[PDB]
Each structure stands twice: as C-alpha cells, then as structure tokens.
Amino acid sequence: VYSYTEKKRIRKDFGKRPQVLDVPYLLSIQLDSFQKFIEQDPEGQYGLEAAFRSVFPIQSYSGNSELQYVSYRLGEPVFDVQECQIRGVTYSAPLRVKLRLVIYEREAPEGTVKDIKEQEVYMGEIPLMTDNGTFVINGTERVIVSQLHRSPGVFFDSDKGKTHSSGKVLYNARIIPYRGSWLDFEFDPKDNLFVRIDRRRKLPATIILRALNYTTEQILDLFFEKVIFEIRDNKLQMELVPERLRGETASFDIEANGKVYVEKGRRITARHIRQLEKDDVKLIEVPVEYIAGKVVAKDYIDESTGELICAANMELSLDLLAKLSQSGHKRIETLFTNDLDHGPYISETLRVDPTNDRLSALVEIYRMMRPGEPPTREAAESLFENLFFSEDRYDLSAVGRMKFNRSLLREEIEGSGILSKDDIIDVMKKLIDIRNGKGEVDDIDHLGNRRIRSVGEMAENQFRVGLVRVERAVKERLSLGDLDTLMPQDMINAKPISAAVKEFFGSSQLSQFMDQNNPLSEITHKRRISALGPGGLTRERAGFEVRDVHPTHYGRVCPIETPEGPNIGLINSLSVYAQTNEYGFLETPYRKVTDGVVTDEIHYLSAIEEGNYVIAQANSNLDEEGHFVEDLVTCRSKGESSLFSRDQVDYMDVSTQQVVSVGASLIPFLEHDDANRALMGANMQRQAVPTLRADKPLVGTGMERAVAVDSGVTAVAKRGGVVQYVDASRIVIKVNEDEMYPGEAGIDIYNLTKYTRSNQNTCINQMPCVSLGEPVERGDVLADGPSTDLGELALGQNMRVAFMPWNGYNFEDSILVSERVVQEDRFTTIHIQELACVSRDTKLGPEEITADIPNVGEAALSKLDESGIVYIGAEVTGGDILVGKVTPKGETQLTPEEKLLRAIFGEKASDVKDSSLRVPNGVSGTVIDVQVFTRDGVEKDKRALEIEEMQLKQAKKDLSEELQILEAGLFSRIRAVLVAGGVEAEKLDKLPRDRWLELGLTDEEKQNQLEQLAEQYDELKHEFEKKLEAKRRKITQGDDLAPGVLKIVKVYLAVKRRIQPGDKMAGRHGNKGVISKINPIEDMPYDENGTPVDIVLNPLGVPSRMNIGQILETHLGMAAKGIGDKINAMLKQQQEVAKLREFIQRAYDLGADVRQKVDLSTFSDEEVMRLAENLRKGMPIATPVFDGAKEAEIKELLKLGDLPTSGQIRLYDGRTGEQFERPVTVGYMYMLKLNHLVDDKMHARSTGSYSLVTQQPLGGKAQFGGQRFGEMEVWALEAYGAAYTLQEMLTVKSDDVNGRTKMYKNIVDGNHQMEPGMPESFNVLLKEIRSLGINIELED
Amino acid sequence: ERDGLFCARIFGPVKDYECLCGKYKRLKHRGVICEKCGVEVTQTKVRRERM
Amino acid sequence: PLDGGRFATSDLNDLYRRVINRNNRLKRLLDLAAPDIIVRNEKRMLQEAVDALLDNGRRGRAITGSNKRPLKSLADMIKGKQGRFRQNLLGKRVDYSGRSVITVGPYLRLHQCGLPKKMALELFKPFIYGKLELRGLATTIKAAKKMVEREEAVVWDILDEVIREHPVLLNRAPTLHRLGIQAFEPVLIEGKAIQLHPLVCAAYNADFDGDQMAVHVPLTLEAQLEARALMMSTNNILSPANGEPIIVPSQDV
Amino acid sequence: WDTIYTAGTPSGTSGDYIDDELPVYQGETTQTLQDYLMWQVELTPFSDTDRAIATSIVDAVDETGYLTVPLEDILESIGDEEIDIDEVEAVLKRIQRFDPVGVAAKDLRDCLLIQLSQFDKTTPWLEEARLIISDHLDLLANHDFRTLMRVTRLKEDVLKEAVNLIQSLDPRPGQSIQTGEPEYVIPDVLVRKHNGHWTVELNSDSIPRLQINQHYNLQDAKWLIKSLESRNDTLLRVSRCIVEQQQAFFEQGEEYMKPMVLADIAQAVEMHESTISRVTTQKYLHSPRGIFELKYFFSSHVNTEGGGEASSTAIRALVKKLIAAENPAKPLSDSKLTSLLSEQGIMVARRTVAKYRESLSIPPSNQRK
Ligand SMILES: [Mg+2]
Ligand SMILES: [Zn+2]
C-alpha cells in the first residue's frame, strides 16, 4: 500500500530487520522549545508567564500604590515570511500586556482600595519562528543552536594527584545554581576544610557555620559521635562499644569480670569484638594514660567555684583530670576519632578558626567580599542574608533542586530555589564521608550531568533580564504622587525589553546565519549541539577529556559527525531517535523484554536510568513470536558489554541506525569504512552544490525521503484533492468535500519559489512534479526543491567509473574527467548575487536617481531605461552601470570661469557629480530581478508603477479564482431552484446568467427564495470587492524607511559556472580529489560495446585508507544499472506488459529474506508502464547502515543483469585500441561537487594599496592583498643562503617606500637592480620604544 | 584643536605645504611659520616622526 | 572614522586623555591649596593612570573600555605574537605574489612548473610595460597601461618573451624545512590551477585534494641567479638532514 | 510606538564574529589625482631640474585639474636663477598630456585646445571647432550664433556640427580620478506631524546602553553619564522651541519663516546666548522637506510697511519666484524687483535686492534673455 509519490518509483530495499518505530519528525527540538516559550500556560512554569510572574507585582517603598500583571497576548504579524525576506525586515509579532495600578489609602487598616485602574500596554516586538524552525531577522534566515552545559546542583570532585607534590588527593564539592554565587568546600593538604565563594580568597570552613546561628557545642554535636565517661570512684570505670575498637591495639588491661579478653601489646581482632558483643562488655577499667590526649566534647565548669575549667575543642591532660576529679564530675563527654573512619577534620578547623561569634564571622565575610571597606553590623548581616537566601538574588531552578536532592538521597523532588542550614550541613557531611572512603566522586562528562538548553529557555532568560531593568525604572518612577491622572501606559518603556530581545536574536554567539548549501546542511544545522557560548566552555581553556566519546553517548550523540580542527569534540550532532526529558536530559528509546518475549512497548531511558539494566543489541535474531534464538546474547550493562543468558535481558534497541546522526545514516556500506574516512565523508556531504538537474543516488540507504520532506524545501499537499491547475510557477488543487470546512470554496494555491538567492549566493528553485488532473493525497510531494528528485534527496550525479592508473593523471588523489561529462552540463551550477543603490538626502540637497548623467556617453547609457535603471534580461560585465544616480556638489564662489563653464556646457554638469552603481570588476551575469522601494510622500516612478501593476494582477488572479467558484455554485443553485417552479429546460439553459438574474415566477415561496439567493449573490460580490480593495491598498502603500533615506533599488544577477580543472569533487566515503584534466571522449577506456567511462580513479587510494565501502558501492551500482538497461531494452522494442511486469517482479523478489514486499498484481497497466518508464535509467536500491546487502546478494543481482559476477570487465585503450592486461573494476558511483571552486581561489598582485601605519601590503583577496612571508620562509631562505632574495623580500617589496618606487622605475626602465633602505616598521618601533621613556638610537 | 593630542602647531600640517588658517600655501612658502596659526608650511608626513 | 563623518578614539588616545585629565586636576588642586587628604588621592590616581598607560594590567587590574575588554598600552604594541617584532619585523606581506590551487602535470621536466597566464599577466606587469615601450609599440606609460588593460593580441607575445628564462618561487605552508620553497621555470598554461611536477610532492608534503600554493617573483639579477643556482629543484635531489635522495618515485611509478 | 521600517538594506556582514580579539585600526592608502600625476612624472624621462619643475607644477593642480598659480609663481618657487620661463612652459606642455589629457590647464580655452590637439587630422569638423575655441569662445557663451556667424563666415550646418563637437569634450578632465566616496549626514532630531501639529523627537540611532562595570573606578564615568543626559535635554529643548516657533515653515515651505535670533531662544529656554550658539551648530534635523541645520532657522529681517518685520529668507524666496517667471523676451532688472516687492509691503532697497540676487547665483537681466 504505497502512496502516490512513492508508487511512481519504488526503491528496492535490502534490509532484513523489521521496523518497530518510525523515524520521528526531525525538527522537533526547535519547535517544541519555541512553543513552550510562546504559548499560554495555566501555571507559571515555562515561557513568558514564568518571566512576568517572576517580577510582578512591583510595589513602591511606601506601599501606597502597586503595579500588577494580568495577562499577555500576541497579535498577527504585519507581513508574511516571504514579504519579510524580500523587503529586508524582521518577521515578528507585537506583545500586549494588561497591567493594573492599585492605590492604597493612608491612615487606614492595611491597603484600602481607593482606586484600581487597568490598562493594556505595548511592550515591544517578539520574533516568531517559521514552520521549519528558523527566524527571519532583517530578512535573512537564522538558526539558534542548542547548548550542552553543566546541570545545576552539587558536584563532588577531586584533583587527580597534582595539586601537591606529595601525591595526596584533595577533594572538593561545588554548589552550582542557575542564578547566584558559587559555594565551594575544599580539603587542604593538612586535612583542614575550607570554604571559597566566587573563586575568591580561601576562608576557614567554620566561618559559614558561625555566620549561621550555630555554636561550637552544636557544631561538635552535628559532626561528631560522643564518648561517655563515668568515674565510679575507681579509675574512671569506662563504658565501651565493641565496634569502636576496630583497627586498634590495646594500650592497657581490658577485662570484664576478671577475664582480660585483649591483653596489653595485643591488637584487637574481629573475634575479640565478637567476644565483647557476646558478653555485652560495658564496664571497662582503663588508666589515666588512656585519657591523656582525648578531646573534650562540651564545656565543663566546677560547681564550687563556677569558673570555666576547659574551653570547647580541648585535648585533656593529667592535671586537668586531677582538677576535675575533686570538682564532683562523674559524667564527662569526649569526641571519637580513628584513621580508617571517623577522622578528625571539623575539630582541627575549629582550632584554626580565628572567629569566636556570629558578628565576627559576618565582619570577616564582609572583608572578604569587600576589601579594605570598613564594615558594620547592618551591611554585613544584610549582605549575608541576600547572598544565598534571597529569592531575587539566588535561584537553584527546579532541575537544580531535583539534582541536589537526588545527590543527597532525599525522597522529595520538589523544593525551593534557596539554600538553608540543612543543605550546607548535608553537603559538608557528604564531603567528609567521601574523604573517609565512604562515597564515590562524580563524572562531569557523564550525560546525566550535562543538560541541553534550547532557544525558548534562552529567550525566556533574556526577557527576564530586560524585565529587571524595566522594574527598576518603575520603582524609581512610582515613588511620587500625581496619581489622580496617571495610567500604566506612561509607566513603562518599550526600549528596555525590545532592545534586549533584538540583541539576543541578532547578535548572540549561538544565533548564526543558516547553512544553506543543500537540505542536508539545513537539517544538520538545526540539530546541532554546542558546548560553547555564554555559560559554556572556551575553545582553548576547555580540556582534553571533554573532547572524548563517552560510553553514555550511545543512542544520544553521534560518535562520527564532528568538525575536525579546533572544535573537534565541542560541536556534536543529535542521533536519529534522541529526545529530551522535561528537565533537558537526552533519552533514547528501547523495547521492553518480558518473559523472554521482545514486545513492542517503547520506553525512553536516560543515562542515569539506563545504567541499571541489561540491554540487548539490534543484531539479535528473533523467532516469529518474539522469542530469542541463542541461549547467549550480546548485551551492555554498567558501561561494558558481554554475553548474558536469555533470561537476564531487560530491554533491546529499536533500530540498527539508532547510534548515528542523519548525515552518517545516508552513507551506504558504512560498516565497511574506517571511522576517520566516515567522519570526513559525513562532513563533506553537506557542502555539495545543487546542479541544473537532480539525480537520485541509485544506491541509497532509505533515509532520503525523510530528509527531503522534513527539510521544508518541497511543496507538500495540505489536503487531498485533484490537480485543477498546474504551471511552472503555481499549483491549484481542488480539495475533496470530505475535508472542506463549511461555507468555503475548496481550493489550495501553492506559489512556487523561482530562482531565489540563498545565504551562500546559490539558486533556490522549485519545479512541479505533478500533472493536470491527477489525484493527490495529504502529505504528497507537489514540487521539488533544490537537490530533490520526486521527493528524494539528490546531492550529486551517477558517474560511470573505472579504477586504474592512467598515465599519471590520477596521481595522488587527482581525477580524470571525460569531455562528455562537460558537454552534458552534469556539474553546472547557478550562482546569484544582489547589489543595492540607495538614494539618500544630504545637506546640499537630495540625491537623484536618473538616466541623465552629465558626463557619460550615449553608449554607456544604452541599457538604462527612462528612469535610470537597467533593463531586465541585460548581460552586464565589469564597469557597466546598473542604476544611474547623481550627488549635488553644492555651490561655489561663482568666479567668471565657472560662469563660462555653466554657459557653455550646461548648468546640470556644474551642480552634480556622478555617483552611480556599477558592476564590480570581474563580475558578470544577467539581470533577472529589480526591486524598488520608495518612501511615502515621494512620487513613484515608471518602474515602481509597473512592478505594482504586476503584483496587483497576481493577487487579483487568486481572488478571481475563488470568486468564480463561489459564483458558479450560487448560479447552479439558482437555476436548479428556478426549474422546479415550472420553467422550460431549454429556455433556461439558453438564457444567460444576466437573464437568469431577471426572471419572474409565481407568488409562492419560490420568489422569496430567489430574492434571498440574489441578495446573497450581491453580498458575495461586495465581500470580494472589499477583499480586492484591501489587497490593492496594501500593495500600493507607501514605505517607511530610515531617516534621510529616500529610495532603495536592488538588482539581482545570475551566472552559470561549469566544471574545470582545479575544482574539488568527492564521494560519500571520504574520497575527495581535484580535477586534473578534461580528456577527449575517444581517449577514454572503452569496453567491448564501445561504451567509454566518465571518470577514472586511482586504485592506490583504497588500500591505505581502508574505505572499502566505495568498491562495494561501485559493484552494486553496476548491478542496478544492468537492471535498468534490461528494462530499457525491453521498453524500446515494444513488448507486452506481461513480460515487463514479470521481469520487474523477478527483480523485486531478489534477496535473502528481505522485509520488503512488492506486489504487482494490485497495479494497473498504466501504473506498471509508468513505473517501468521511471526505472529505465537504473533501479534504485536501499541498503541500511548496519543492515545492508551481502556480497552474495550483489552477485545474484549481477547475475540477473547478465553481468560478470566478479565485477571486473575487459577494457581497451582508446588511443591505441589495445587491451589492458588485467581486468578492471568498472561501475557507477555517486559524485558530488563541493563548494571549493577555483574561481574563488586564484589571486595575484604586483602592486596595490598599503597600510597607513606599517606601510605594508594589506591582506585578503577581496582587498587585492599580498602573500605573507613569515618567519619560517625567512628560515628557509637563510638555510639556502639566498641573501639578496631575502633583502628583496624585506625591503623593496614590503615597506621601503623610496626603494619601492625606485625598484618599479628601474624595472620599467630595463635595469634590474635595487637600492635598498630602511623599513618603516623599524622607525615605528623606535618611536614606540621612545614613547616608553627609553633612549634607543642608531649611531656611527 | 589647539594644544590637544592632534595639535597642528606641535605635530605639523595636515596637508602638503598648507598652514591651518590658510594664509600661506603652495611650495613657494616652504619652511615659513605662519604667524596667525603657528603652523609650519612643510610636508604632512612629519606627523609620523614628531613627538 | 565612522559613518556620518565622525571619529572614535583609540586606546592610546584614551590612556593619554586620562593621564592629561588627572594631571590638570592635580595641578589645579595644588595651586588652589587644597587639604592634603585630597591632593594625595589625586596623586595616587595620577600614578595609577600613568602605570596603566605604560603597561596596562601588569599592576592592579586592567582598565577596560566600552567593549568590556582591556585597552592596548605601549607594551602591548611592543611585545607578544601580535607585536612589531614578530608580526612586522620578522615576517611581512609582500608584492609580486599570488596563490592558487595545485594540480598535477605528468609531462613536465624537473625544472619546470605550469603557471596560468592570467596570474603571469598580473605578476609580470612592469616587465611587460618595459618591453612594450622598448620596441616602439607604446610611446608613453599610459599607452602601455591601456594596452595591457585591453589585453590585445600582442601583449601575449610580450608576456611569452619576458617569462622565457625567468624563474619563480613556489611555496606551500607550513614550511617545515628549506625544501618548502623551490624555484622553477614557468610554462604558460590555460586554466586557473598551478601544475606541479610529480617527483617533488614528497618534498612539499603535498597532494592534489585541495592544497594551495603561493608563487613569488624574484626581481633583480642577483635574486634570479640565486634562484637558478641555489633554490632550483634540480639542485635539491639529496636531503640535507641525511644523505638520502628526496626526489624519488612513489605510488604509480 | 516608534515607526517600524517597512523596508531596508540587509546588512553587509555575514559572519558570526566568533573571534574575541581583533587588531587596532590602521587604515589604507588612497590614490588622488596628484598621486596619479606624480606616478606618471616618475616614469617619464625628465632631468633633475625638469623633475623639480614637474613637482612644483603638480603641487599647484586642484581637484578639477586646473592650474591655480601663474607660471611666474612656479618659476620663483624653483629657487634657481639660471632657469628661464620657457623651460617651465615646456615641462608644463609635457605634463598636460598625461592621463587624463587636458589636466593642469591654465583656463578653459587652453584645456579645450589641448584636448582637440590629440584628435587625428581626419576628424571632419576639426578646423572649424578649433577656430571657434581659439578666437571666439564668449560669443558661444552668449548663445549668439549670428555675430559669430558674421565673423566666422560660415553657414548654419557647419556651425551646428562644430558646436556639437565642442560640447562633446570634457571641461573638467581631472574629475575622472574618483578617489572620493559620497559622505552623508545623520539627522539628530526628527520632526513629524502629530494631531495636525509638528512635534520633534530625538533620533534613536544613538547608544543608550546605560551600563557600569561593577565587577571591579566607575565614579568618574558616573558624571559623564549625566553629562550625556544634560546634552540630550538641552538639544531637545532648543529644537522643540525652534519647531514650536516655526510651525508655518514646515506647512507651507519658505516665504513664511519668522525673523528669529539667538536672544529669542535664549530667553525662551533660559540659557545664555553662547550656549544656544553652540548647540545649534553642525547639528541637523530631518523633516518631510529635507535635512536642515538648526542654524538655518535664524535670519535677519527688513522693515515691513504694515508695521511688522519680514525675514530675509522670505525675501530671497520671493525674488526667486519672481525671477523664475519673468518675461523671456525681456527679463527683469532689480529696479523692477524693488518696485514689485514695494507694493506688497516689503520695504527693501535696490542694492539689497542685487545682493540677494548675487547670493542666489542668478545672472543679471541682460544675461537672462
Ligand atoms: Mg591535501
Ligand atoms: Zn596660517
């Protein structure tokens, strides 16, 4: 059951694994994000609602009045997308916000409602996204790239053993919010915790705790375990917990009930702990020596004196114990420390702590944040309260809170965006646990720790950024009176918001001009992920491990498509099936496996969730009921891969192309290519240039239709129907009544795009692919965009190729091309260019565009029309005039000489100067379009009037079509009702429509119904008259331009470029080269039938590169062309349709248990003949990336076409007629033409313009610059010993001015000799050094 | 401006053999210091070598 | 300069202005006999301004402009990879040079290269003017200028005359040893690509998949003789690193 | 709402400005007329004295290509007493044939003769045009064609062909070398009609991005911030007063501008006359009539017999209108003009009318017929 656009030409598929999930819409990532940004939200979680409710309500200091927000809305754009692109403006919509002002009375309880006034206010413009995920900013299409940044939350890291020379590892923990400051906890080489804020000066860790309402007793309670001391009047009989003794050796006699379980000099073992636990040993007799250095827990004071005995954080001593013994203290508390666990770190830091109370810590914090500034209590306390605990200054977001709680093992996902005491305490405890070997550090490259941020979120952030400034202005303004007449309209300004939005959309790092070589370039650009930009990494100070393929990239990021060079590893592409969470984490689909039966349930798993399961591969063979085959399957689990039993499997991949991007999925036989060559080919595939005609690959992968249709370059039927009108520039579809809305004429009109410029100055051109009267369905292809062929992606041409060396003309990646390739314009491209002439206004009068240029000949003005604008269709070269303009010179003193000049040669030649627009030198083409924009108030010229007439005719055409359909329907109804009254059949038919209007009847309801129908007819006529009037008004409206600008004229030129030596060609497998020669057709190798080859490639480039995919592609292309040749031979000698369909069914039935079923019994003979006519140049074939065709199937298909099974034939030398001594591999390969034309590379210079400061030649081809002769070339010349050549390079060719002039004069004079001097840059250096107060000079 | 970072009395003339006020011009006044403006009548390249 | 006939100040001018403002304010305060706690503050700010002018960012913090980036001091002009020494005095851009994409010529001899004639017409222009004036075709320089502009049929004969035994230097970047520059005798060809002898590619580390080369013209007699005797490809068959041949066959040969 | 542009020129830049460090501005060199002339001088087989004379000569060429000092000035400027004037004449003759031909000419007749000397002798009407230019070049300026015909002793057709050949030459040969690009002006205040009355508003091309560097000093720039605000306020107030007082100039063009001075605006805006003179200089406003400097609205006045005052610009416009529609057979003398303006209530003199006519660059009555 194939669609109409697919039934014309069906691609034979060699894949063998059934599909369980279709490829999604490829541009979801942009559309979903911007829809979240723009749509209304009942809550305030996303979009403009979240930004508005983040700021409003805004209230004054006195509380007397308040400004509040109610709702927002977006109006319809002024222009359409095509109009915006043509004119050069931004496609956007206006934002309207309903604010309200409330007044509170004074000397009243709370806020008394004196008056509330609500008003709608204009906030600015917001650019809108088109149907293809693009923005039209100033008439050019742009893409905003998604960003891969670090997720908010808490992250634990450690140095790898580098920060100190001792090899000890130092741990740290950072808190990363969405907005706010950074909070780092770090370990010192002396095991002292420290706290850092915003990478500032290191501070003691406990300063934060003391800033909070915390005391040393409470700190030690939080971070330490107690030890209880009872002095039972005999050697302080101690209580013991057995597990506390692990890792220790007895320092005394440890006994219970007179039995010493562990003696002095004996280490405590596990069995001794077992004995203690069994005996419940509590009373332990220890000497004073066991308490010689233990740290006291709390403060103790004698009950007699009452004075302080020992401070907190104090290690005991014999004298202190003796003193406290007589103080009547029997219960004492101490800390508990060890080495394998429960290490002392907080107590030592408290020892290093210089502060004592909360106020001192706050003052210290103020000193750290503000250096030298004399602090007070109020400023410090306010600053510390606002640093982390103010909603307006610190936000942790919702994803940040989720990650924070998930890191500390809390059962709640929700929370607040601010910190608290518990959060900091838990972070410190987790860091301590990791220090004690009771935790694991994070991995900052795991894709569970990296978040995706798209266009909507960035736009929301920028909008909030503008709203804060508007809020500040409102608060400053609202603090006054005069409220009896004030309205919110005079309260806010459009500039602080519209300026920010415009800046973000037009001048951000991630806002870029769209890549537009071909549809694949656009698709790749829109699915790109970047690690750079604001809030991201930098190209130099990024690292080495972030540029690496992490195991969690499987199914989420393509491991093959990345730009080689500086940005390798930092720019990535999305995978085919990859999605994002509601939090922004990439996830991928899997099939759930239950009871050993692979089901069809699809679950999207993220990197965190995926690591807990066992996931099979898509290569696994299954039965017909879903069960596996072998008792062992290859699976991934916990980041590795191995064999698992049939029952240990949890999931399974959906497809074999799940791990690649769109660009890499279009390479046939990818599994036979080395990864470097695959990367190079994937990059090269998206810089191909469209040609005059498209050509489907004839060896594909089955992904061509998806890329063709989801790119938006084609015309797609919105509703089903019949092609009522077809033309080279428009299509009109007559919609089925099953899909027509009530009360309308059902027609769809598509206006195709003809010869339009792209961002890369190439041609964009749509062509119809349907015929008159044929039926179409919803979603079918009606027109083909650039590089598309019947709805399939077609980036290149099918070339007949041979692999052999040919006299050294394919030496080292050179390409030998036939002359027949050039004769047929197979690689000919169209390039379009735009130029503009602006007639402005200046002080000495207005500039004028005219054809009467004072001092040019009649021949130069031959191609300008009566208005001074070049004709459409003219051929122009360098220096020709496109638009004629003059500029006023002003007025002079009017000496008698000037008066004589005015008298003789006319007064116009003395008032104006020639400032026309000319074709740049070295540029040709044909004028294909001129567009004129005139400011309002000024008068239109003949050219603009003709253009407006054309546009008005174009609009009137569609209006007339719809009106004609409705009129015909109404007249049909009128006549049908009229006959029923008793009117003659033939008389009514011969009566014209005007006569049908005027006719009488009986006095029944027939007359009333006829009157109603006539009134409806008149109303219809009036409505269409109104529509036409409005369209004419819009077309003929004047234009608003920048101040001073009076007129704008735009001219478009078009040229055709042909292939030539020096142009770059490539295949899809990383095999690039340069054309070296164009060979006459009778010099090319030919086979036994006299058929020559198109291209000869060197076979020595295959074995060292290991891109074996090209050889297999050549063999399969040969087979496909053989099938096409058989079909063509049958078609030429007209044979019966039965034989044709028999052979085509045989061709489609080939293969070893493929998944594609084609049945030709359900085809009519017309469909069979049309299909055979579409297959006569070769039957196209699809081979998926990792589910392709085997060698046996290729050999079978070769046998079907009566071709040698080895793929190698006998060739002959065209120059001598002699047979080459070995068989040669001849086939068909898909070649591309890359945008590296030699026309844009060649450059030369003898003398030109120089820099003003250094007096050296400038750089670049566009400036007619010179070539740089750097240090390494100087070293080479020194190594040779060529002193005079070097002195020529340094002096008389760069910056010795007198030497320059004298050398030129000598060369023209025939005397090759130089008189060198001193370069100017050395004098500049002397001046710059003397400007530093240093006396440097030449001498003697 | 006068006595500024680009003064013509200090660093020289901005045009070949022309003073700032315009009284003295052309090659026949070379080396003359105009009394009205104080600008020497010389080449304009001396602005590359006067500190 | 900007649009509308207005100018914007550069970094050195900004630093000079700040120094002058501080100096004027300090002078006025000192003449006015202000209290010491103010003249000392002005003196400190003047010292900071002078330090910023001489070497910005070395002491304290770099003062930034409108683009939130530090200004360029005099030391910045002097030093670095973008300073005078490394950017202008040790390497520089030159006249009489071009560049283009390289193709292969299997018919060439070891001392020959293939040069497009449009590049040659641009590179050898004063030689063409001299030869045109020498043989009476042009009496003045402007006549020769017009004749070369029109590309008449005789200027191609002149061009073939001037390039007959005049070598050119071919260079491919990066230049890792001295064999990255070599001298050849040009053969005028059509097209826009430079033809290169197959036996020298290994010396250049070059291949015909998109590489480009620069071409330079030696002017004086000493330079031409140095090209013929020191740098020509026929004098460079042995490596200078070791004693092995470098111009050796490979691949198809 | 501020008007949004319905058309524009798409910006020339097509890059992503990725690089975070770009060098300092240096500029390029330009080739003017004199650069080209000196380049041709160097490549000419002169001598040392000849090259010095050529340098002095090329120094005196102006933008139009005409010599601006007599040859005696050049001979004096050489500074050597052996050199005569004929050597200077020979060097000048050689220079005058440089490209473009006719450059460095003493006057128009010399330039035209130089250009005609280069045409081949087979050009048809060469001798006649040469005679016209050499002998009678002002009779052509008077468009006489009859006295010139009475002197040249020629028929009508030959004279017409000679005149057409003469007018096909180039009167300003040195303007071919175009080193300049048309520079423009940016209006600072825009005047538009709201509610039938003209109101002014500042142009939004400026830089209003109020920002501070709180990361690290900015106290001095805090004063410049409000200095800019003061500048904007004073400009807006002065322009608003000017437009409010001149509500009739925009509606009906000239002939209705009022005779205002600096003191009036100074009294209106409460500022010194010097401040008004400073603000309203080299600052422009854009109106649906054109771009005008603020100084354009200040003008003198003459006594009106009705008891009022008439601006000088209004009288200039009236003189222009009257002269534009004079009698083609016999034009109007300024005595007639002072009479016509007298009856309207404008009491001006006759020499004042002549001065106004001179400022407008209008030939006298005898030359307008
Ligand atoms: Mg290469
Ligand atoms: Zn002067």
Side-chain angles (χ1 to χ4, degrees), chain B residues 19-24 34 36-37:
Chain B
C19 66
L20 196 55
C21 68
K23 175 179 294 186
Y24 300 92
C34 187
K36 231 207 70 174
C37 55

Short mmCIF file of all heavy atoms in Angstrom, two decimals, chain B residues 19-24 34 36-37, ligand 2:
data_model
loop_
_atom_site.label_atom_id
_atom_site.label_comp_id
_atom_site.label_asym_id
_atom_site.label_seq_id
_atom_site.Cartn_x
_atom_site.Cartn_y
_atom_site.Cartn_z
N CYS B 19 49.21 75.87 5.76
CA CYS B 19 49.02 76.11 7.18
C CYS B 19 47.54 75.98 7.54
O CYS B 19 46.68 75.82 6.67
CB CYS B 19 49.56 77.48 7.59
SG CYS B 19 48.69 78.90 6.90
N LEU B 20 47.25 76.04 8.84
CA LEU B 20 45.90 75.71 9.30
C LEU B 20 44.91 76.81 8.96
O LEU B 20 43.77 76.53 8.56
CB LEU B 20 45.92 75.45 10.81
CG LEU B 20 44.70 74.73 11.37
CD1 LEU B 20 44.48 73.43 10.63
CD2 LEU B 20 44.86 74.48 12.85
N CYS B 21 45.30 78.08 9.11
CA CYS B 21 44.38 79.17 8.84
C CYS B 21 44.19 79.39 7.34
O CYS B 21 43.13 79.86 6.92
CB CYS B 21 44.86 80.46 9.50
SG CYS B 21 46.38 81.15 8.82
N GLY B 22 45.18 79.05 6.53
CA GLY B 22 45.07 79.15 5.09
C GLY B 22 45.73 80.35 4.44
O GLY B 22 45.54 80.56 3.24
N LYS B 23 46.50 81.14 5.19
CA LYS B 23 47.14 82.31 4.59
C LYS B 23 48.26 81.91 3.65
O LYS B 23 48.37 82.46 2.54
CB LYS B 23 47.66 83.24 5.69
CG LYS B 23 48.43 84.43 5.16
CD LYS B 23 48.90 85.34 6.27
CE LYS B 23 47.73 85.99 6.98
NZ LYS B 23 48.20 87.00 7.97
N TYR B 24 49.11 80.98 4.06
CA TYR B 24 50.26 80.55 3.26
C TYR B 24 49.98 79.19 2.65
O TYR B 24 49.50 78.28 3.34
CB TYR B 24 51.52 80.49 4.12
CG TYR B 24 51.91 81.81 4.75
CD1 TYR B 24 51.47 82.15 6.02
CD2 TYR B 24 52.73 82.70 4.08
CE1 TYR B 24 51.82 83.34 6.60
CE2 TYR B 24 53.09 83.90 4.66
CZ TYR B 24 52.63 84.22 5.92
OH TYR B 24 52.99 85.41 6.50
N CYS B 34 53.57 80.33 9.81
CA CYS B 34 52.50 81.32 9.79
C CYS B 34 52.34 81.94 11.17
O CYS B 34 52.31 81.24 12.18
CB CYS B 34 51.19 80.68 9.34
SG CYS B 34 49.84 81.85 9.08
N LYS B 36 49.68 83.76 12.24
CA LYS B 36 48.32 83.72 12.75
C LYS B 36 48.04 82.40 13.47
O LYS B 36 47.47 82.39 14.57
CB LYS B 36 47.32 83.93 11.62
CG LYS B 36 46.29 85.01 11.91
CD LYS B 36 45.00 84.77 11.15
CE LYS B 36 44.25 83.57 11.70
NZ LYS B 36 42.91 83.40 11.07
N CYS B 37 48.42 81.28 12.86
CA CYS B 37 48.11 79.97 13.40
C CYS B 37 49.31 79.23 13.98
O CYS B 37 49.11 78.30 14.77
CB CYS B 37 47.46 79.08 12.33
SG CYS B 37 48.40 78.90 10.80
ZN ZN E 2 48.29 80.26 8.93
#
